[PDB]
Design a protein around this nucleic acid. Structure first.
Lengths: 129, 341, 64, 330, 94, 357, 91, 64, 129
RNA sequence: CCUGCGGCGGCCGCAGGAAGAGGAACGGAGCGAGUCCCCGCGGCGCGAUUCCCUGAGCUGUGGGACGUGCACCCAGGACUCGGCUCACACAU
C-alpha cells in the first residue's frame, strides 16, 4: 500500500520506497538493543549533547510546530535526517501501538554494515531548494 | 485601456474622482514628447559602469560629452566594480537623495583561503549573516549597523575555492567587509574577488540599460545628422523613477501657484489616490502628467472626501521651473470677495 | 485528546470523533501544540517556514 | 662524476592521471631525509629516502615558490615545517609529518588588500622569513606569526631596483644578502640596516635563480631566457668574471645549484640535457630523458641527484612526466 | 591591570592565528576597539580587533599577545575585560 | 497621440466600499455639514507606528491546553513588553478555544467583550449505555433556554439559545455537542444535568471554544508560538510584517455598531469628558434609535469613545440644537488631539458677556 | 404539621432518583431540603435543582439505602411550605 | 575576471562560473567593454549596427 | 565537426570549411616569421599607418563593442577581411592557448602562392544581399 | 455635575476637566554662504626599432619601460544667516 496523501508542506526530503524498508529493519535491530531514542523530548535532550547519528521524521504529522526545530538543529550540528510517510507504521516498527513522529538511531556493531549503508544513502538524497 | 496610458498617468481611471470641471490650457507638454532641448535637461541615465574608472569620473565624462551643467549618481561604486548606476542631468539632481538611499543588490565572488567541507557550509554561514549587522569601512574608525535583507548561494567551485553570493542589502553596507567577516566565520579565511551591482533603487538590470558606447553614439548621431531617434532610447524622463509614489492630480490654474510656493489646497485638487496617510510623501502631477513637486501629505485620503477647503499638503521639493504655466491665482468664486473688501 | 476535524470546501472546521475524513484523508487534532514560555527555537521555525514558503507573512493579506 | 651516473629509482605513475601535467622543481631537505616536489596540479609531494608520496598537500591556484626550514632536524617535530606561497592565498606553512596546516603569514597592500609573495626564503638563524614583492621585500619573524612585518623598499622613489623580485639568497661569509628581479637586475643589501651597497646587471632575461659558494666570495645567477650563467665575485667589483652555456627556450625556471663540497656545479636545460662543471671547465653531460629538465638538486650528505621533467604543449587544429633519482660519485 | 573584571565571551575556534570568540556578556554591552582581554587569572592575552554579527548575538575576534598560541585555548573558554571599556548598545539601537 | 484627462460635466460618485475596517462607507452616511478645519494629529488605525499599533491592539489567540487563562495573559504580556493586558473570559486550565487578548490600551472594552454571546463544542462521556443515538439529541433539546445552574455555590440562572449533537459513539459512550450560550454559563454543570436527565450520569471530558463575541475561529487565529516568532523576528530583522498579522487594531471589534463622525475640535473635549452637542456632528448613520449603543469616531476613522444615543436619526436630521449622546466609555488617550473649546462665537460671547457682568 | 406537594417520580439514576417539580406557581425548594411522603417519614434531601425556568427538575438522594424499586412509576412526594422560595426572586 | 552568465527561457541573467551553457553554448562575460572618453569610431560602430539590423533603434519600443 | 552556433550577428561573411583550413595553414606559415599582428591594439595601430594585408576576425567575440569598428575601418582603406568560426583555434594557429579576436597577416615570399590564392578567394566571397 | 484610574452590585480614595466645537493665506519657495553629516605609488590618449611581451606573472577583450600631454578628486542633507531673488497664492 503506497498512498502519498496527507503529507506535511515540509515533507521534503522524503525517503525512497526501499529506503523505508531498510530504515525499518535498521530501527528494529536497534530496538533489539538499547541504542535507540524515542519521543521529541528525549530527542532534544540527547541531540543537544552530541550523540551523532540518524534521525527519522514522520511525514504526516500536524500541527507542524511540535517538532519543526529539529530540521534546523540538525544543520547547526551537521546531522542527517530523512522523512518517512506514516507515523503509525513508524511506531509499530519502534515497538508500540501509540505512534510517534521522531525516531533517532545510534550505531552499533551488530548492524554496522546496514547502518553505514543507510547513512551513506541518506547523505546522497537530493537537496530541495 | 487606461492601463496602456503612460507613466504617472497609467491607471488614473482607478482614482477617487473629486470634480470633473476645469479650464484646459494649451501650455505644457507630455513628458515623453518634450522638446529635445529640455527632454535631456530633465532626465536620468540607467548606466552600466565599466571597471577601470572611478564613480566621480564616469559622470564627469557623461557631463562633458552631453554638454550639460550638473550631474549626480545613485550609488558610489569603487573602481573595478560594474553594474547599475543612475546619473541625473542638472534639473534632475533634485531627486538625487531619494536615489542615494534605496535598496541595492549585488553579485560577487569570495576567495576562500583554505579548503572547507563544501557549499552547504558556506551557505549556512551566509544564512547566519542576515538582518542588522555591524560594519566598518574597508579602508575615521567608527562602528555602525547595516541591514542585509536576503542572501543566497549561486555556485561553488571546490578546486579554485570560489563562491558566488547574491545579496539584497541597504545603502552604505560594505561587501568588502562582509566578505572578511564571512571568512572569519568559516575559520578558513576570505577576500572579495568580484563585485557587481545588479539593482539600484527601482531601476534593475533587466530592462533599460545602456553602455557608454550608446551615449557617445547618440550624441555623435545627433550632432552630425541632426537626428535624435537614438537619444530618445538612451535618456528617460524623471517620471520613470517616481512611478511608485502616491499621485495627486490638479488643475491648470493651480500649477503655477504651487511652482511659486503656495501649499496645495483642496479647491485646486482634481483627483486623489486611494491610500494616502499623514506625513507620507506623495507626487503632485499635472493633467498632462508631469512631476510638479514632491509633497508631504497632510490629509488622509478620507479627510479629503469630507472637507471643502484647507491645506492638503506641503511641498518638500519642487521640480518644474517657475514660469511654465501662466499666473492664474487671485480670481475665483472666493478670494475675490476679500479683494472687494 | 479525542477531538478531530476536517475542512470542507467552504473552508471551516468540521469536528468529528473518528480518525479519517469520509473521503479517505486523516484528520488533524483540533487542539493546538503545547507551548513552553522559555522557548528558544523561533529562528529554527522561521527558517523552515520561509524556506517552504508556508509562513503566515507569505500568505495573502486578510480582507478588511 | 667519473662517467654516466647510475639510475637508482623513480616515480612516474601518479602524474599520468592528468591530461596535461609537469613538474616544477625539486629540493632536498637540509639534512637529507626527504625531497620536495611541485606539480601542475598545485599539489606538493614528499618522498622519503616506484616511489609513492607519503603526503599530498593540496593548494589553491598557482604556487609561486616554496622552501624548507633553515634548520630542519628530523629528530625534533618543531623544526620540520615547509613554507609555501600561492597566487592569491597568504604564505601557508604546513606540518611536514601529518600534512596539515600549521600557521600563516599575511601580506597586506596600502589599500588593505592581500598581495601574494613571489619569492620567499628563510634566514640563516631561522628566526626571520624574507619575501619577494614588486619593488619591495617584506621582512617577517617566525615567532609571532600574523600580518605584522617590516617593509623594505627595494626601489626608492627615484633610483634602485625595479621589477618583481623573484629570488632571494644569503651569503655565509659576511652579513650580506642579495635579491633578483624580473627586471633583469641583481641587488645587494646589508642585513642590519638594509641600505643598498651595490647593484648588478648583465642578463638578457628575468633572473630566476641565485646561489652562493661556501667561501661566500663567489656566487652565481640564472635567467629566464638568457643562455649564460654569470659568475660574479664580491672582492674585485669587476662585475662579470666568467660565463657558461645552456639552452633556455621557454619562460620557466630552470634549477641549478652547487655541491656540498663546493667545487661541482650542476645545471639543467630545456632540451633535457644535464651538464656539470668544476670550480669553469665542463666535466660531464648526460641526458636523463628526452623532455625538458628543469629541477636539479644535490644531496647534502651522500652522493645523490634527482631530476624533474615536463613542459607545456602548444597544439594546433588537425610525452610523459617522470621524477628520477641518480647515484653519483663526488 | 584593573582591580575588577567582567565576563566578556567564550572561545569558539581559531582563524589564521587569531581566536574567534562568541560574545556572552551581561545584557548586550559591546566592547571597545583595542581593549585588552584578560583570562581568569587577570593576565593579558590579546586585544579585541574585529566585531561582527547580528545586533542581538554577535561575535568578535582577538589578536593574540606576544608568545601566545591559538592552540593553547580550549574548545569552550572564558575571557574577562576591564569594565571601564564596554559601552551600551542603546547607541546602536535606532 | 496626445494624453490628457479631458474635462467633463457629469458628476461622479465615490466608491468607499473597499475602504478600511472602520472608514468603510462614508458615502452612505447622511451628511450635515462639510465646513471645518482638520489638524495634523492622529493617524489611520491600520497605519499607526508599530509602537502605538500594538498598544491599542488585540490578539485572537488559540489558548494552549496545559496552562490557565491568567497564565497565558502573563506570558503574552511578558513577550510583548507591554504593561497591562486582559482577556475575553476565563477558561478551564484544560480546555482550548479562542481567547481575545486586549493589549494595554484596548482593555477599556474588556468588560463589553466579556459579556458577549459565546459558543462551545465539547465531548460528554456517559457512565452506562443508552437506548440509542437520538436519545442524546432529544434530551439535549429538552434542556435549553433559560436554565437553572450552579457554580461547580449560590444557584444562578443562565440561558442557552440553541444546541445540537454531531455524532455519538456507542462503544466508548462518547458524544460531541455544539452549544450557544451567554457569558458565564457553565458547561460542566450542563453535562451533569444531561446525565441526570438521561438517568445514567455523565461528565465533561473535552471542551473547545469556537466563537467568542465577534471574533471566531474562521478568522485570523494565532497560536502562542506565533507571538514569540513575531516578536523575535521584529527584534532581529527589524521586519514588522509578521507582527501586523497577529496584532489587529481595536476598531475591528466595533464594526457592527452605528457611527457618528466628529469635528477635530470636538474630539479632545469628549476625551476630557463632555456632552455630545450638535455643532460637532458632521455625519451620522441612518437607523439610530433612542438609548441605543453607538460609537462616535474621528474623520480619520478611529473610534474615540462609546455613546448612548439620545436623539433618533430623524430628529437629528431636523433639529436646531440639543444633546446628541452621553458618554459611556472613553477609549482614546486624552491629549491625542489638542484641546480647543473655549474659542468660538457662542462660547466667546458667553465668556465675554459674563466677564462684563 | 401539614406539608405541600413537591415532586413526582420519573426514573431512578445510578445513585439517586429524578423528580419532576410541580408546585404552587412553580416555587423552588431549598437545597438539601428534607422531603417527606404523606406518612411523614423522610425520604432524603434534594441534591440539586436544574431545568428550565418555567418547568424544571430536581434529584433527591435516597435514605436508609432503600432500593429504587420501592417507588412506583409515578408517586408524589411532599414538602413543608416553610422550606421553599418564590420563583420571582431570581427573575 | 571569473564571473560569467547565460540567459534562460524567460530572458534574465543566470549567473554561472563555468564557461559553457548546460546546453553546450558559450557563456558571455558579465562585464561591459572598456570605454575611452575620446573615442573616434562612433560612425564605424553605427554604420555596421545599422547594416546588420542590431542597432538599438531597430529594436521594438519598450512599454511605459 | 561544424556546428554553427554561438556566433555574433555580424558574423558574415563566413569562411567555408576548406577555406578555414587554408587560412589556418597560411597563418601558421606567416607566424613562422615575424610578419603577423596580434590583438585589437596592434591591428588598429598599424592599420592607420597603411601596411596592406589580410584581416581575419573571430566569429564568436562578445561583446562586439571591443572590435566592431574594424569591418568599416577596413573599408575606409579597401582591405579584405573574413570571419573564422572560433577564437581558440585562431589562438592555437597563432601559437598560443589563450584566444584572440583579430589577426592581421602580412605577405612574404615563403608562402606567397598560398597567400595569393587565399587572397583571391577572399575577394571572391559573396555578400548576404 | 462629567470622565479616567485604584481600592472592598455598591461604596470609598485620588486625578483630570467644567467643555455648546473658531480661523477660504499662515507663514512659504528657488539660490548662496558658514558650521556638521554623508564619502596625489590612481584614470585616458599619443609617440619611438614591428617600442616590448602568449612569462610557469594576471594579460592580447590586454600587461610593462621611456617620453609625453590630458582629464578626475564631487554632487546632495541638516543647523545658523546679524544674506540675494521671486512671491505672499482657497485655483473661476
Amino acid at each position: 500500500q503506497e498512498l502519498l496523501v496527507n503529507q506535511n508542506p515540509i515533507a521534503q526530503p522524503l525517503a525512497s520506497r526501499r529506503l523505508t524498508r531498510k530504515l525499518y529493519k535498521c530501527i528494529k535491530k536497534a530496538v533489539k538493543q538499547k541504542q535507540i531514542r524515542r519521543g521529541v523530548k528525549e530527542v532534544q535532550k540527547f541531540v543537544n549533547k552530541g550523540e551523532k547519528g540518524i534521525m527519522v521524521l514522520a511525514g504526516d504529522t500536524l500541527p507542524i510546530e511540535v517538532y519543526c526545530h529539529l530540521p534546523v538543529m540538525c544543520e547547526d550540528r551537521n546531522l542527517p535526517y530523512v522523512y518517512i510517510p506514516s507515523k503509525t507504521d513508524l511506531g509499530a516498527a519502534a515497538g508500540s501501538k501509540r505512534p510517534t513522529c521522531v525516531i533517532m538511531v545510534k550505531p552499533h556493531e551488530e548492524y554496522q554494515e546496514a547502518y553505514d549503508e543507510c547513512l551513506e544513502e541518506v547523505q546522497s538524497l537530493p537537496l530541495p531548494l | 485601456d487606461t492601463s496602456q496610458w503612460p507613466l504617472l498617468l497609467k491607471n488614473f481611471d482607478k482614482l477617487n474622482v473629486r470634480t470633473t470641471h476645469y479650464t484646459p490650457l494649451a501650455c505644457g507638454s507630455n513628458p515623453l514628447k518634450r522638446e529635445i532641448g529640455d527632454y535631456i535637461r530633465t532626465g536620468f541615465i540607467n548606466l552600466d559602469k565599466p571597471s577601470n574608472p572611478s564613480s566621480h569620473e564616469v559622470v564627469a565624462w557623461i557631463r562633458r560629452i552631453l554638454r550639460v551643467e550638473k550631474t549626480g549618481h545613485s550609488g558610489t561604486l569603487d573602481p573595478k566594480v560594474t553594474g547599475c548606476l543612475i546619473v541625473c542631468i542638472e534639473r534632475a539632481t533634485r531627486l538625487v537623495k531619494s536615489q542615494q538611499s534605496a535598496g541595492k543588490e549585488y553579485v560577487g565572488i569570495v576567495r576562500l583561503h583554505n579548503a572547507i567541507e563544501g557549499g552547504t557550509q558556506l551557505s549556512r554561514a551566509l544564512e547566519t549573516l542576515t538582518g542588522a549587522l555591524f560594519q566598518r569601512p574597508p579602508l575615521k574608525r567608527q562602528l555602525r549597523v547595516r541591514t542585509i535583507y536576503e542572501s543566497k548561494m549561486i555556485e561553488y567551485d571546490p578546486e579554485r575555492r570560489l563562491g558566488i553570493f547574491w545579496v539584497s542589502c541597504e545603502a552604505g553596507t560594505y561587501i568588502r567587509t562582509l566578505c572578511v567577516h564571512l571568512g572569519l566565520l568559516l575559520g578558513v579565511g576570505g577576500q572579495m574577488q568580484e563585485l557587481r551591482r545588479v539593482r539600484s533603487g527601482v531601476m534593475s538590470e533587466k530592462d533599460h540599460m545602456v553602455t557608454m558606447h550608446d551615449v557617445l553614439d547618440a550624441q555623435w548621431l545627433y550632432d552630425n545628422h541632426k537626428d535624435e531617434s537614438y537619444l530618445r532610447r538612451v535618456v528617460y524622463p524623471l517620471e520613470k523613477l517616481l512611478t511608485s509614489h502616491k499621485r495627486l492630480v490638479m488643475k491648470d490654474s493651480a500649477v503655477n501657484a504651487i511652482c511659486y510656493g503656495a501649499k496645495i489646497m483642496l479647491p485646486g485638487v482634481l483627483r486623489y489616490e486611494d491610500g494616502i496617510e499623514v506625513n507620507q510623501e506623495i507626487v503632485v502631477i499635472t493633467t498632462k502628467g508631469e512631476a510638479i513637486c514632491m509633497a508631504i501629505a497632510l490629509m488622509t485620503t478620507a479627510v479629503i472626501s469630507t472637507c471643502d477647503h484647507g491645506i492638503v499638503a506641503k511641498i518638500k521639493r519642487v521640480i518644474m521651473e517657475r514660469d511654465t504655466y501662466p499666473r492664474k491665482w487671485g480670481l475665483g468664486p472666493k478670494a475675490s470677495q476679500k479683494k472687494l473688501m | 485528546m479525542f477531538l478531530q476535524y476536517y475542512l470542507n470546501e467552504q473552508g471551516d472546521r468540521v469536528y468529528t470523533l473518528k480518525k479519517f475524513d469520509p473521503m479517505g484523508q486523516q484528520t488533524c487534532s483540533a487542539h493546538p501544540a503545547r507551548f513552553s514560555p522559555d522557548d528558544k527555537y523561533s529562528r529554527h521555525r522561521i527558517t523552515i517556514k520561509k524556506r517552504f514558503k508556508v509562513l503566515m507573512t507569505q500568505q495573502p493579506r486578510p480582507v478588511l | 662524476f667519473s662517467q654516466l651516473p647510475r639510475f637508482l629509482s623513480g616515480s612516474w605513475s601518479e602524474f599520468s592521471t592528468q591530461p596535461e601535467n609537469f613538474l616544477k622543481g625539486c629540493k632536498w631537505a637540509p639534512d637529507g631525509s626527504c625531497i620536495l616536489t611541485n606539480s601542475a596540479d598545485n599539489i606538493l609531494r614528499i618522498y622519503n629516502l616506484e616511489m609513492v608520496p607519503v603526503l599530498r598537500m593540496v593548494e589553491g591556484d598557482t604556487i609561486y615558490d616554496y622552501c624548507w626550514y633553515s634548520l630542519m632536524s628530523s629528530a625534533q617535530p618543531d623544526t620540520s615545517y615547509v613554507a609555501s606561497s600561492s597566487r592569491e592565498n597568504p604564505i601557508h606553512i604546513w606540518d611536514a609529518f601529518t600534512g596539515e596546516l600549521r600557521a600563516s603569514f599575511r601580506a597586506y597592500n596600502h589599500l588593505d588588500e592581500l598581495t601574494a609573495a613571489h619569492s620567499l626564503c628563510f634566514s640563516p638563524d631561522g628566526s626571520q622569513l624574507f619575501c619577494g614583492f614588486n619593488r619591495t621585500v617584506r621582512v617577517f619573524s617566525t615567532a609571532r606569526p600574523g600580518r605584522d612585518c617590516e617593509v623594505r623598499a627595494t626601489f626608492a622613489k627615484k633610483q634602485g631596483q625595479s621589477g618583481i623580485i623573484s629570488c632571494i639568497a644569503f651569503s655565509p661569509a659576511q652579513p650580506l644578502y642579495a635579491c633578483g628581479s624580473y627586471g633583469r637586475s641583481l641587488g645587494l643589501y646589508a642585513w642590519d640596516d638594509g641600505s643598498p651597497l651595490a647593484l648588478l646587471g648583465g642578463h638578457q632575461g628575468g633572473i630566476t635563480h641565485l646561489c652562493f659558494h661556501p667561501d661566500g666570495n663567489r656566487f652565481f645567477s640564472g635567467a629566464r631566457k638568457d643562455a649564460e650563467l654569470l659568475c660574479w665575485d664580491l672582492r674585485q667589483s669587476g662585475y662579470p668574471l666568467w660565463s657558461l652555456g645552456r639552452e633556455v627556450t621557454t619562460n620557466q625556471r630552470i634549477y641549478f645549484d652547487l655541491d656540498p663540497t663546493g667545487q661541482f656545479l650542476v645545471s639543467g636545460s630545456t632540451s633535457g640535457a644535464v651538464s656539470v662543471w668544476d670550480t669553469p671547465e665542463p666535466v660531464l653531460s648526460f641526458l636523463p630523458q628526452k623532455d625538458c629538465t628543469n629541477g636539479v638538486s644535490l644531496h647534502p650528505s651522500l652522493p645523490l641527484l634527482a631530476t624533474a621533467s615536463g613542459q607545456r604543449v602548444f597544439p594546433e587544429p588537425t610525452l610523459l612526466s617522470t621524477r628520477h633519482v641518480h647515484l653519483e660519485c663526488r | 591591570p584593573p582591580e575588577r573584571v567582567v565576563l566578556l565571551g567564550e572561545f569558539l575556534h581559531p582563524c589564521e592565528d587569531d581566536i574567534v570568540c562568541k560574545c556572552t556578556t551581561d545584557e548586550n554591552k559591546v566592547p571597545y576597539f583595542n581593549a585588552p582581554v584578560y583570562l581568569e587569572n587577570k593576565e593579558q592575552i590579546g586585544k579585541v580587533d574585529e566585531i561582527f554579527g547580528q545586533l542581538r548575538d554577535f561575535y568578535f575576534s582577538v589578536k593574540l599577545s606576544e608568545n601566545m598560541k591559538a592552540s593553547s585555548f580550549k574548545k569552550l573558554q572564558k575571557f574577562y575585560i576591564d569594565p571601564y571599556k564596554l559601552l551600551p548598545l542603546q547607541r546602536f539601537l535606532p
